[PDB]
Structures are given as structure tokens and as C-alpha cells.
Amino acid sequence: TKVEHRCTTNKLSEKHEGSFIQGAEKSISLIRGGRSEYGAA
Amino acid sequence: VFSGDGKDFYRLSGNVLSYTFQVKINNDFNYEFYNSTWSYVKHTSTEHT
């Protein structure tokens, strides 16, 4: 008598995370008249 | 001349065509940023009996 029994398996996992934040700010200002300390402020 | 940007009288030369203390202030701001992040994970398994 002869007997054989066998099994095999393959498995995977993956995970990801990602983030991207982007920003722009601009300001433009003009003042005329006044005194330079407060006009500066 | 009386100024007013500093609150003081001053004396001009007789030559100068005009001297004036009106203020002008001009400001320009530009700010630009980006932040990026990536994360990755992998797992693999293989088996026999």
C-alpha cells in the first residue's frame, strides 16, 4: 500500500495611506496719507 | 514747512522745487506651502505541507 496527502497556500496583504495639503496666500495693500508708524501697522 | 509725519517744523533750501511729507505705504505678501506624505505596507506569505 502507498498513500500521500498534501496541501499548499499563498496569501498577500497591502495597505496604503497618503496625504497632500497645499496652500497659497497673497496680500497686496496700499496706503496713502497718515503717519508712517500707524500706516505701517 | 510743518511736516506732520514727524510733528516738527523744518527749514528748506531756497533751491528745492518741492519737498513734501505725504506718506505712501505699499505692502505685498506671498506665502506658498505644500506638505506631502505617503505610507505603504505589503505582506506576502506562502506555505506547504
Numbering used by the authors:
A (entry chain B): 393 to 433
B (entry chain C): 146 to 194
From the paper:
Soluble MAC (sMAC) is an immune activation complex that is formed from MAC assembly precursors released into plasma and scavenged by blood-based chaperones. In accordance with lower resolution studies, we find that C5b supports the assembly of complement proteins (C6, C7, C8, and C9) into an arc-like arrangement of MACPF domains. Similar to MAC15, sMAC contains a single copy of the complement proteins C5b, C6, C7, and C8 while the stoichiometry of C9 varied between one to three copies. As the molecular weights of secreted clusterin and vitronectin are ~80 kDa and ~75 kDa, respectively, we attribute this excess to multiple copies of both these chaperones. These data confirm that sMAC is a heterogeneous assembly comprising a single copy of a conserved core complex (C5b6, C7, and C8) together with multiple copies of C9, clusterin and vitronectin in a mixture of stoichiometries.
